[PDB]
Design an enzyme around this catalytic site. Structure first.
Site, PDB file in Angstrom:
ATOM      1  N   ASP A  65     -19.554   9.685 -38.033  1.00 29.63           N
ATOM      2  CA  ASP A  65     -18.324  10.401 -37.762  1.00 29.63           C
ATOM      3  C   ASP A  65     -18.400  11.103 -36.413  1.00 29.63           C
ATOM      4  O   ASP A  65     -18.396  12.324 -36.345  1.00 29.63           O
ATOM      5  CB  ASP A  65     -17.989  11.374 -38.918  1.00 29.63           C
ATOM      6  CG  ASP A  65     -19.087  12.388 -39.219  1.00 29.63           C
ATOM      7  OD1 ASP A  65     -20.255  12.216 -38.771  1.00 29.63           O
ATOM      8  OD2 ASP A  65     -18.771  13.379 -39.914  1.00 29.63           O
ATOM      9  N   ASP A  69     -23.329  14.526 -32.016  1.00 31.52           N
ATOM     10  CA  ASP A  69     -24.632  14.103 -32.562  1.00 31.52           C
ATOM     11  C   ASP A  69     -24.640  12.605 -32.852  1.00 31.52           C
ATOM     12  O   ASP A  69     -25.593  11.920 -32.523  1.00 31.52           O
ATOM     13  CB  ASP A  69     -24.964  14.831 -33.869  1.00 31.52           C
ATOM     14  CG  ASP A  69     -25.141  16.323 -33.688  1.00 31.52           C
ATOM     15  OD1 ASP A  69     -24.138  17.060 -33.805  1.00 31.52           O
ATOM     16  OD2 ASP A  69     -26.272  16.782 -33.447  1.00 31.52           O
ATOM     17  N   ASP A  70     -23.591  12.107 -33.481  1.00 29.97           N
ATOM     18  CA  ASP A  70     -23.504  10.676 -33.806  1.00 29.97           C
ATOM     19  C   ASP A  70     -23.468   9.843 -32.542  1.00 29.97           C
ATOM     20  O   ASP A  70     -24.047   8.755 -32.503  1.00 29.97           O
ATOM     21  CB  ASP A  70     -22.267  10.303 -34.660  1.00 29.97           C
ATOM     22  CG  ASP A  70     -22.036  11.243 -35.811  1.00 29.97           C
ATOM     23  OD1 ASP A  70     -21.768  12.445 -35.561  1.00 29.97           O
ATOM     24  OD2 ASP A  70     -22.110  10.802 -36.970  1.00 29.97           O
ATOM     25  N   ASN A  86     -15.524  15.608 -42.491  1.00 31.24           N
ATOM     26  CA  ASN A  86     -16.067  16.644 -41.641  1.00 31.24           C
ATOM     27  C   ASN A  86     -15.085  16.853 -40.492  1.00 31.24           C
ATOM     28  O   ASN A  86     -14.773  17.979 -40.146  1.00 31.24           O
ATOM     29  CB  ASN A  86     -17.440  16.197 -41.151  1.00 31.24           C
ATOM     30  CG  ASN A  86     -18.223  17.304 -40.539  1.00 31.24           C
ATOM     31  OD1 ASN A  86     -18.474  17.284 -39.323  1.00 31.24           O
ATOM     32  ND2 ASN A  86     -18.595  18.305 -41.355  1.00 31.24           N
ATOM     33  N   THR A 114     -24.765   9.107 -41.206  1.00 35.48           N
ATOM     34  CA  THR A 114     -24.927  10.353 -40.458  1.00 35.48           C
ATOM     35  C   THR A 114     -23.696  11.262 -40.573  1.00 35.48           C
ATOM     36  O   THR A 114     -23.537  12.204 -39.785  1.00 35.48           O
ATOM     37  CB  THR A 114     -25.283  10.082 -38.972  1.00 35.48           C
ATOM     38  OG1 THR A 114     -24.188   9.440 -38.302  1.00 35.48           O
ATOM     39  CG2 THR A 114     -26.533   9.226 -38.850  1.00 35.48           C
ATOM     40  N   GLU A 153     -26.141  22.018 -46.563  1.00 34.70           N
ATOM     41  CA  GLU A 153     -25.849  21.447 -45.247  1.00 34.70           C
ATOM     42  C   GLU A 153     -24.486  20.736 -45.264  1.00 34.70           C
ATOM     43  O   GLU A 153     -24.034  20.252 -46.321  1.00 34.70           O
ATOM     44  CB  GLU A 153     -26.992  20.492 -44.858  1.00 34.70           C
ATOM     45  CG  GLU A 153     -26.855  19.756 -43.524  1.00 34.70           C
ATOM     46  CD  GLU A 153     -25.970  18.511 -43.596  1.00 34.70           C
ATOM     47  OE1 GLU A 153     -25.867  17.903 -44.699  1.00 34.70           O
ATOM     48  OE2 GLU A 153     -25.341  18.156 -42.556  1.00 34.70           O
ATOM     49  N   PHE A 154     -23.846  20.668 -44.094  1.00 28.96           N
ATOM     50  CA  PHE A 154     -22.448  20.246 -43.968  1.00 28.96           C
ATOM     51  C   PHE A 154     -22.133  18.849 -44.532  1.00 28.96           C
ATOM     52  O   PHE A 154     -21.170  18.706 -45.279  1.00 28.96           O
ATOM     53  CB  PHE A 154     -21.951  20.318 -42.506  1.00 28.96           C
ATOM     54  CG  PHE A 154     -21.671  21.710 -42.009  1.00 28.96           C
ATOM     55  CD1 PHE A 154     -20.429  22.303 -42.241  1.00 28.96           C
ATOM     56  CD2 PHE A 154     -22.638  22.433 -41.293  1.00 28.96           C
ATOM     57  CE1 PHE A 154     -20.165  23.597 -41.793  1.00 28.96           C
ATOM     58  CE2 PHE A 154     -22.370  23.723 -40.839  1.00 28.96           C
ATOM     59  CZ  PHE A 154     -21.130  24.303 -41.091  1.00 28.96           C
ATOM     60  N   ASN A 155     -22.872  17.823 -44.107  1.00 30.01           N
ATOM     61  CA  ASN A 155     -22.606  16.444 -44.548  1.00 30.01           C
ATOM     62  C   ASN A 155     -22.628  16.311 -46.076  1.00 30.01           C
ATOM     63  O   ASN A 155     -21.749  15.636 -46.652  1.00 30.01           O
ATOM     64  CB  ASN A 155     -23.580  15.443 -43.931  1.00 30.01           C
ATOM     65  CG  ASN A 155     -23.329  15.190 -42.444  1.00 30.01           C
ATOM     66  OD1 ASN A 155     -22.272  15.538 -41.903  1.00 30.01           O
ATOM     67  ND2 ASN A 155     -24.303  14.560 -41.778  1.00 30.01           N
ATOM     68  N   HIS A 210     -29.049  16.427 -34.330  1.00 25.41           N
ATOM     69  CA  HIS A 210     -29.315  16.019 -35.715  1.00 25.41           C
ATOM     70  C   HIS A 210     -29.409  14.499 -35.893  1.00 25.41           C
ATOM     71  O   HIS A 210     -30.508  13.943 -35.944  1.00 25.41           O
ATOM     72  CB  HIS A 210     -28.272  16.622 -36.658  1.00 25.41           C
ATOM     73  CG  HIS A 210     -28.142  18.110 -36.541  1.00 25.41           C
ATOM     74  ND1 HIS A 210     -28.961  18.978 -37.230  1.00 25.41           N
ATOM     75  CD2 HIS A 210     -27.287  18.881 -35.821  1.00 25.41           C
ATOM     76  CE1 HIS A 210     -28.605  20.221 -36.947  1.00 25.41           C
ATOM     77  NE2 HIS A 210     -27.585  20.188 -36.099  1.00 25.41           N
ATOM     78  N   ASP A 211     -28.259  13.846 -35.897  1.00 26.56           N
ATOM     79  CA  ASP A 211     -28.106  12.443 -36.303  1.00 26.56           C
ATOM     80  C   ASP A 211     -29.099  11.422 -35.713  1.00 26.56           C
ATOM     81  O   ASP A 211     -29.573  10.555 -36.440  1.00 26.56           O
ATOM     82  CB  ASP A 211     -26.668  11.969 -36.025  1.00 26.56           C
ATOM     83  CG  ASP A 211     -25.612  12.875 -36.669  1.00 26.56           C
ATOM     84  OD1 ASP A 211     -25.953  14.006 -37.110  1.00 26.56           O
ATOM     85  OD2 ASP A 211     -24.441  12.464 -36.746  1.00 26.56           O
TER      86      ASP A 211
HETATM   87 CA   LIG Z   1     -22.344  13.124 -37.944  1.00 27.03          CA
END
Ligand SMILES: [Ca+2]
Ligand SMILES: [Ca+2]
Ligand SMILES: [Ca+2]
Ligand SMILES: [Ca+2]
Ligand SMILES: [Cl-]
Ligand SMILES: [Cl-]
Ligand SMILES: [Cl-]
Ligand SMILES: [Cl-]
Ligand SMILES: [Cl-]
Ligand SMILES: [Cl-]
Ligand SMILES: [Cl-]
Ligand SMILES: [Cl-]
Ligand SMILES: [Cl-]
Lengths: 312, 304, 312, 304
Positions: free
Chosen positions: B9, B13-14, B38, B116, B156-158, B231-232
């Site tokens: 998404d 980060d992605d 998200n 991710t 965590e968000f995801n 992150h991703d």
């Molecule tokens: Ca992401």
């Protein structure tokens, strides 16, 4: 001085906490109160009185409290014919009958009759008596100096992946306690798992050479037996006396302020003490709760050994 | 080689994960699938296509997937950088059906799913075609945290965007690596890292440095970070080289009923590490900072 | 003769229950206990004492109890400085001082000092005091003759689609009460929504022509005001006195035995009294709980009118 | 006339609904879709095809759908009758995709969904293609109960099997008629009804009478019933003639978090009946017993 009410469910760990409280001269033990839920009220009340008898401390009051959790059902093993006392050791029969009156009412009367800011509550069992006292007399909360409880864990569980026994037995009562505006130190598994009963510690206790030191060493033999299938431990931890150790000397039990609340609705997470460790440490002004982090192993065991020597 | 579907998404980060996947020759990116929840499906689908265009990866399919969580309500082109208009049109068909058709038409044990974003497309694919589960080689997802939360103290968000979908994914019998916040919070965008990226001196390296400027802006009020984490791309880093992302096997489940603990990835760390035979899930623990950033920098250089 | 403790939160409905209890010679009111949560403890305690004063029942003890729910937070409207008493009517200042001691302890001491099987508990507010008493002294449960409470609803809600106010204020306390082994009659909304304050009823009350009958008619004027925007009612219901009506004459309030439990975890269903109406009516032996179903409208209002006449 | 997709899990009740749909000329059965969860997908898919074969309806497509609930775990011929082997092979493609393709390819406002099993396929279709929702004319489902439960004191089997899927369906903006236990418990299989069916004297009427023998056996220890109810065909009866199944508009939602109340369809009956404009959901209340059984008997006669 540090004046305490020890609310407990002995329990071999609680017995060690009783000995530390009695043996250290900086602690004034006002009395002992007992709570059922982890084990039966009748068993732990007898054990508390017999432990006090062993230490010649029959002038310390004992009051029996709640026999089950506030809301959830009682889950204790059935009583066994031919079991009295604490497993693995022998204790003299108590010479004083149990003091009359419910522990909850005694805790309330005691806090209301003493000067404000002087009494520290030290719960080392489920939090049922403490929660009940709070609801029956809300005026105790601002009068209590501090609550130092053995329970919970911010990154460690034992009963589950995330929760600890004392909290999970009565999560509702724990929710009450953690959400009152009084200073709380949560001495959780993160801390107590460092309080290891190593051969060297136990040898120093054995060398004291009294009935009480043999009793303490017997408690430690039980811890080892209880933890024999637990591969996270070469030597077993001791839990409850870490609360009294913190009160004797803050440097023995480091703390970190953070919001702490109790999960009472979750499937997987029931009884979790949820510590918010995001961001920097807030001030005591802003945050009434703190979690125990790092044990001074050497100082902790010195306190135990010195208390046992002082009791003779 | 590791052959992946990147379900994402973008998301800055992605975008970094896309660049790492494309730039490292040990990764075969079969295609990109997108998920809303998200942020909006429309925004992130455009961003995925435009990022691929920026990297001259016009041969990579993009399919749009689910626009909201399975059960809970929906609560919702990259800021700070400029992206070319995609030359490849959005490929037709739902991502969930594309994921299914792709896994069923390729040999078993060859495709690794790399989610991710929220786990909605993955959960939906599983339920629509249960035969995908034993065919998938591994799932390596960015999400969760065993001792760290960001959205809450513990979650965590995801995961929290679609806890139900996460519950589905974690309770299927396929190998899972959870690349959580415990791991990704070590992937710090230090001035020295960013200076090495800046020195590459291409449009793509400037794009990557722009992503890093955004991370810093997003984390500017977060006092746990002098420099922001990324992150991703840690998911793809793990697949390139297991030594970059250490792992510890443990049971992991998702809390979907709790008040305080909603969306928590509950990792059972009691007792010794169980065997792969006995435990299909593992959590990411320790990052090799030095090797991680070398992977990113090398991928950016390879893309020219 | 039924001997009761009326645990209440007056409340215009509770005031009507007090008048019925005092005015009917088959009821022996041992005392009144009060509970906060729906409204403030201080307000409802004053209202109970002033109502008793209005009815020349200065011999009846009043004890104040819990001021908030067991577990969930207190949700009561902010106090207003020109409010004392019950809205819309005037009550004399109480001449008897508030009796000392917590209601929970008084309920316990009373039940333990009287012969077993003689006291009936009549809760008409949230169930907090009753739950607290049970946990503080488990021996009260088998000693209580019956619990007849105003609360719940098997097929009707008011606060929500499925839940009623008294239960929802403290669902945990309600869970405690419903899961003890004592006989319970749940006088819920299914029943009380039939207790309609029609013009003809109120005219018969008005004709009694005393201060007390005017007071009762004033309570009924308040019910009408409270229900003015509620399109399910041409005339408003009265709730709490239906508990006392049941105890005076079982034919006034029909009942149906069934398992009843309280939902404490649901989103939509929080505070629901879940009545299992599948299958035939189980026996009293097998089922300690029953729900109130059908009101005898005519007999109910005759009880109210006769009580008001008897009080003079 | 009313054009339907019958999403079902036969199931002796569903078999009766199939016969009513086929036998009444005001119903156009576009096709049958099947769902596992109450019983196994494999069993109920075979039973649906064999029932259609018994009624000489070999032109009616059958598509198999989901084999388990969205989130919660799976907990799983027709007993007492004999069915011919189906001559039409199972049609290819997942029911969820077929439901979507059918709704998207037909004119808007023409298809009525008739779910008589757990709501898993319907929820999955909604999430995979949100554009179906405004296109569907109405959803008329057998499930729930406003003041009656069977599986629990408050909840009904179809809803409780997949409460999450039910939550999805009830919270979309499409018109819903909930034909719950309040209604279906009036649809009693009395000796006189069964005697009228027996007198038709065909293989199909004997099949229907066999279904009724099963209902009686299933309910033999249930003391609330001298004669057993039949559930699923009440949905089709409502669509044939609204006067057969009275309805009351009210908000309806599904409890998915409660201990005691899991799977409850919570109907807000406080205040007066809101308008169709304001309230998309309605519950079935009163059955016209006489007209209901006439519809069944007439359908059985028409099928020959
Ligand atoms: Ca992401
Ligand atoms: Ca203890
Ligand atoms: Ca009241
Ligand atoms: Ca069915
Ligand atoms: Cl020494
Ligand atoms: Cl400090
Ligand atoms: Cl900065
Ligand atoms: Cl290994
Ligand atoms: Cl006695
Ligand atoms: Cl009269
Ligand atoms: Cl009877
Ligand atoms: Cl279920
Ligand atoms: Cl029968």
């Amino acid at each position: 001085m540090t004046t305490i009410i020890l609310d407990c469910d002995p329990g071999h760990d609680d017995a060690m906490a009783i000995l530390l409280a009695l043996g250290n001269p900086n602690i004034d033990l006002l009395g002992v109160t007992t709570v059922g839920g982890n084990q039966s009220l009748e068993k732990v009340t007898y054990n508390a009185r017999a432990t006090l008898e062993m230490a010649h401390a029959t002038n310390i009051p004992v009051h029996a409290g709640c026999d089950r959790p506030m809301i959830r059902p009682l889950e204790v093993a059935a009583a066994v014919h031919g079991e009295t006392g604490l497993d693995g050791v022998t204790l003299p029969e108590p010479t004083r009958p149990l003091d009359e009156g419910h522990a909850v009412n005694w805790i309330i009367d005691t806090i209301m009759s003493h000067e404000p800011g002087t009494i520290t509550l030290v719960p080392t069992g489920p939090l049922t008596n403490i929660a009940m006292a709070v609801r029956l007399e809300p005026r105790i909360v601002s009068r209590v100096k501090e609550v130092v409880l053995m329970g919970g864990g911010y990154h460690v569980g034992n009963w589950s992946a995330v929760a600890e026994f004392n909290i999970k037995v009565d999560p509702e009562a724990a929710h009450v306690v953690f959400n009152e505006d009084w200073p709380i130190t949560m001495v959780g598994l993160d801390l107590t798992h460092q309080a290891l009963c190593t051969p060297e510690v136990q040898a120093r206790i054995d060398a004291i050479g009294t009935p009480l030191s043999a009793f303490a060493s017997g408690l430690m033999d039980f811890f080892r037996k209880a933890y024999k299938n637990n591969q996270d431990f070469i030597d077993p931890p001791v839990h409850d006396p870490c609360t009294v150790a913190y009160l004797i000397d803050h440097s023995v039990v480091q703390t970190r302020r953070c919001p702490v609340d109790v999960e009472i609705k979750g499937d997987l997470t029931l009884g979790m003490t949820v510590a918010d460790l995001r961001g920097p440490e807030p001030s005591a002004d802003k945050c009434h709760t703190q979690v125990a982090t790092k044990l001074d192993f050497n100082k902790f065991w010195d306190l135990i050994i010195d208390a046992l020597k002082e009791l003779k």
